[PDB]
Design a binder for this molecule. Structure first.
Ligand code: CA
Ligand code: CA
Ligand code: NA
Length: 274
């Protein structure tokens, strides 16, 4: 009855969960297209919507619900299993139905998160340009102690060209690229100097509106695996700073090749949370 998506054991989230660490008391904000709150495999504790006309607890696109599922689908007897199934989950709607958002809408969500005390923020979204307000938002969240994770971008490679989008590109943000179930880099994952770590991003099965489950591909899919890992580490070592959590993830990652296409490699939560 409950499926375990390959990504979970691929990053060894399962071993950690077997230790009794599932993210309980860790608050994660999913900055996305909203979350279908009524899905039986998800427990949304609160949120906000910065998109006109849509409440934070519906998802007319599906993207947000899928991403939240990877972080926290409930550990039960149905559907799927999140990386950190006991986290307190907040849906912060910054992208519209069509999956796109404004800088000031994004910026408001990041501030909301900061203000409301989230421990980790996930942003499976990215644009070619950043903005000063956006950079300020992320630098302050991180300086305040929140772990900020964003998808690197689905731009691929070209010659020696950085294809990493914003906000993943800022240095207070962890840029995550995508591997497939064979741990190989997926063709669509952006490349560049800023790429930091890789996680499962191809063929990822998660929660999906209405009350179902679907497979999607994307750096968007990889990101929540890292947000979820951070949450696991915190559940295990609540004492750590954001930068400490960050550093554990990159330092213990499994090496796969050059950092321009792989960052430091694929995350290993079990080694990270030692
Ligand atoms: Ca529900
Ligand atoms: Ca489940
Ligand atoms: Na970055």
């Amino acid at each position: 009855a409950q499926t375990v998506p390959y990504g979970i054991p691929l990053i060894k989230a399962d071993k950690v969960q077997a230790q009794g660490f599932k993210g309980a008391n860790v608050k994660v904000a999913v900055l996305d297209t909203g979350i279908q709150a009524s899905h039986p495999d998800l427990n949304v504790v609160g949120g906000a919507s910065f998109v006109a006309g849509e409440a934070y607890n519906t998802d007319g696109n599906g993207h947000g619900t899928h991403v939240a599922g990877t972080v926290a689908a409930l550990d039960n007897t149905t559907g799927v299993l999140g990386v950190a199934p006991s986290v307190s989950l907040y849906a912060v709607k910054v992208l519209n139905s069509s999956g796109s958002g404004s800088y000031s809408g994004i910026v408001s969500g990041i501030e909301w998160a900061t203000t409301n005390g989230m421990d980790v923020i996930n942003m499976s979204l990215g644009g070619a340009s950043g903005s000063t307000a956006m950079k300020q938002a992320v630098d302050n969240a991180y300086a305040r102690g929140v772990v900020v994770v964003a998808a690197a971008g689905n731009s691929g490679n070209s010659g020696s060209t950085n294809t990493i989008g914003y906000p993943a590109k800022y240095d207070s943000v962890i840029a995550v690229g995508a591997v497939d179930s064979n741990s190989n880099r997926a063709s669509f994952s952006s490349v560049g100097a800023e790429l930091e770590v890789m996680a499962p991003g191809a063929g990822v099965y998660s929660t999906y509106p209405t009350n179902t489950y679907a497979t999607l591909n994307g750096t968007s899919m990889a990101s929540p695996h890292v947000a979820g890992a951070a949450a696991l580490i915190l559940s295990k070592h609540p004492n750590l700073s954001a930068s400490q959590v960050r550093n554990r993830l990159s330092s213990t990652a499994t090496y796969l090749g050059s950092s321009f296409y792989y960052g430091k490699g694929l995350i290993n939560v079990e080694a990270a949370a030692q």
